[PDB]
Amino acid sequence: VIPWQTFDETIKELSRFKQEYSQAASVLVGDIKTLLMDSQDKYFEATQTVYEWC
Amino acid sequence: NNASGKLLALDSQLTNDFSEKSSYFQSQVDKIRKEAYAGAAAGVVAGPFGLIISYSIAAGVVEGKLIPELKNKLKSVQNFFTTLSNTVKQANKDIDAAKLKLTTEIVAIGEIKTETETTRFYVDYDDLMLSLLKEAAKKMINTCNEYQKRH
């Protein structure tokens, strides 16, 4: 008369979706953070080399 | 650069999983109340004495001991989350200060290397009394003395 098991299955299935996409998006945004910092190091080194030659 | 991206990936997962645990808590408290007050209604195999002796035990143990203990455990999880967020926020400042120190020293060394290369080219005129080379050497003496005074 009180469907508690279907309620728990629904809550856990809505809660697994969010865990999956958080774990997927966080790794990719951290990778983009690493790439942007690497690009800023390469930019600094190139413009400093040309500055010292000039 | 790799650790500074791992740190962002940890911080975002931390802030999402804390909210999912905070919703798990509220869905679990209602399950405890459902089980307790549904099992206490089976004290009708005796009279109303058996009914009050079941609802008193249920509403005493669940509302007086179990739910405040779960709330204290959740408050502990909240304080842990705040401490770990401050740890990540301090690690970012340490990494940024180290990188700024290194790039400032690269620029300061390049200011010496430019004068050294200019003097090395002025030597190639094969004239040691050339005023341009004398002035470049007098400039390098002051540059090297200022670098030794700074370190």
Residue numbers in the entry:
A (entry chain A): 34 to 87
B (entry chain B): 142 to 292
Please quote the authors directly:
The crystal structure of the ClyA pore complex was previously solved as a dodecamer at 3.3 Å. The EM density map of the dodecamer presented here is at 2.8 Å, representing an improved density and structure model. One typical example is the side chain of Y196 from αF, which is buried in the membrane. With the cryo-EM density map, we were able to re-assign the side chain in parallel to, rather than pointing toward the hydrophobic membrane environment. One protomer from the dodecamer (Prot_12) was superimposed to a protomer from the crystal structure (Prot_cry). Based on the comparison, it is obvious that the binding of mercury atoms pushes away the C-terminus of the αG helix with a movement distance of 4.6 Å at the Cα of R291. This represents an artificial distortion of the local structure by heavy atoms, although the overall fold is not affected. Extensive hydrogen bonds and salt bridges, spanning from the transmembrane regions to the distal soluble regions, mediate the interaction between neighboring protomers within the dodecamer, which is also observed in the crystal structure. Based on the particle numbers of total particles and those used in final 3D reconstructions, the majority of the complexes were 12-meric, representing approximately 80% of all particles, while only 11% were 13-meric. The inner diameters near the extracellular edge of the pore are 70, 72 and 77 Å for the dodecamer, the tridecamer, and the tetradecamer, respectively.
